[PDB]
């Protein structure tokens, strides 16, 4: 279960606020996934009294974004059993909603999640991941790029395995940090979206086996 509650003394237009709250919520709390298991009980609330007077809705939306986002990474770093935060950044999607669909599929892949845990540059799994979105027939593997941190592993320019050998090694380095970044371009249109999660450790299995939660 996700629970989160936000409290402010800012006066805001009630209409602009709900609208604002929704857009931040979709970019943050609606963008994170530990095990895919959407609980029975999630609840995200913000309380706004006017006690400090009128804030610029704009400044506020920014403030909240910054806040929810800190709490979201904070969620993903603390992922049950996690050793690593996975930040999957998708661009070039047909629209934003495809971006996130492709993001989510990637960060929810057990094979991706374990490879990130083991520090094994098994990027081909990130290919399998994208591939899983089989109803998006405008995802063309010829046009799709992949990167881990600042290293592109796909598509293969030229011939053989030496391009992949060095730089798969470079990927193995980046993986050793406590925060892994997966970059994916579709080359379709400007759809962008970042999702968050975490490696799948064995701690994940032990926790959810030996305790009743």
């Amino acid at each position: 279960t996700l629970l989160t509650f936000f409290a402010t003394d800012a006066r805001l237009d009630p209409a602009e606020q709900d609208r604002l709250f929704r857009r931040v919520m979709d970019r943050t709390f609606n963008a994170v996934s530990i095990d895919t298991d959407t609980s029975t009980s999630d609840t995200a609330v913000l309380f706004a009294n006017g006690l400090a007077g009128e804030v610029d809705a704009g400044e506020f939306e920014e403030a909240l974004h910054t806040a929810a986002l800190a709490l979201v990474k904070d969620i993903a770093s603390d992922g049950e059993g996690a050793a690593k935060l996975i930040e999957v950044q998708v661009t070039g999607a047909r629209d934003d909603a495809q971006a996130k669909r492709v993001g989510k599929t990637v960060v929810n892949s057990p094979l991706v999640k374990t490879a990130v845990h083991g520090c094994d540059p098994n990027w081909g799994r990130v290919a399998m991941a994208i591939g899983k979105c089989s109803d998006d027939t405008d995802i063309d593997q010829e046009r799709v790029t992949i990167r881990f941190g600042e290293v592109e592993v796909y598509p293969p320019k030229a011939r053989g395995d030496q391009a992949d050998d060095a730089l798969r090694a470079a990927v193995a380095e980046h993986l050793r940090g406590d925060e892994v970044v997966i970059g994916i371009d579709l080359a379709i249109a400007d759809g962008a979206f970042t999702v968050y999660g975490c490696d799948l450790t064995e701690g994940y299995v032990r926790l959810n086996s030996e305790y009743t939660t």
Partner: protein
């Protein structure tokens, strides 16, 4: 830090560790509210009631119970959720529809009503403000640490608290 926020926390035997597990977060002042929730087919009764409370975009607080999610607990479970939600509003001298309820923890397990009953009978307004730290601990279940965050904007303060690191991929609306 923000004005007119007070925080109530306490042990109620949701687990048997005497840990704070019962939070009331309220405002001494009428608050406009914005909220989204799970769309699960096993939405707990805590959720249904919240959707109702926030229907008027008008709410002053939330009572949160951790280490029992109160879900798939049939008619009785729905009855306790009415009961806990109403009795918190009432202890605080507030109208029902101005108080929400949220509950996290195990599924299929009845509340310890005997225990919650007795705590309620003592519940009243916490003097002074803030304490969002206590709230961030009091809601926490498989979380290894609390999660708080605070931001200044144009003379006002905005605080947030969060919880959850398993059974987690929100799809809220």
């Amino acid at each position: 830090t923000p004005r007119g926020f007070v925080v109530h926390t306490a042990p109620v035997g949701l687990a048997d560790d005497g840990r704070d597990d019962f939070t009331v977060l309220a405002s001494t002042a009428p608050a406009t509210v914005s909220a989204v929730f799970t769309r699960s087919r096993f939405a707990g009764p805590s959720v249904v009631l919240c959707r109702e409370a926030v229907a008027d975009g008008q709410a002053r607080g939330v009572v949160v119970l951790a280490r029992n999610a109160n879900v798939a607990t049939g008619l009785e479970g729905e009855e306790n959720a009415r009961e806990v939600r109403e009795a918190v509003a009432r202890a605080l001298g507030l109208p029902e529809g101005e108080m929400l309820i949220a509950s996290t923890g195990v599924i299929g397990r009845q509340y310890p009503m005997e225990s919650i009953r007795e705590h309620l009978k003592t519940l009243e307004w916490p003097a002074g403000e803030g304490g969002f730290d206590r709230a961030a601990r009091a809601i926490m279940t498989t979380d290894t640490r609390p999660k708080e965050v605070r931001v200044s904007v144009g003379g006002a303060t905005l605080v947030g608290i969060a919880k959850g690191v398993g059974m987690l991929e929100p799809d809220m609306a």
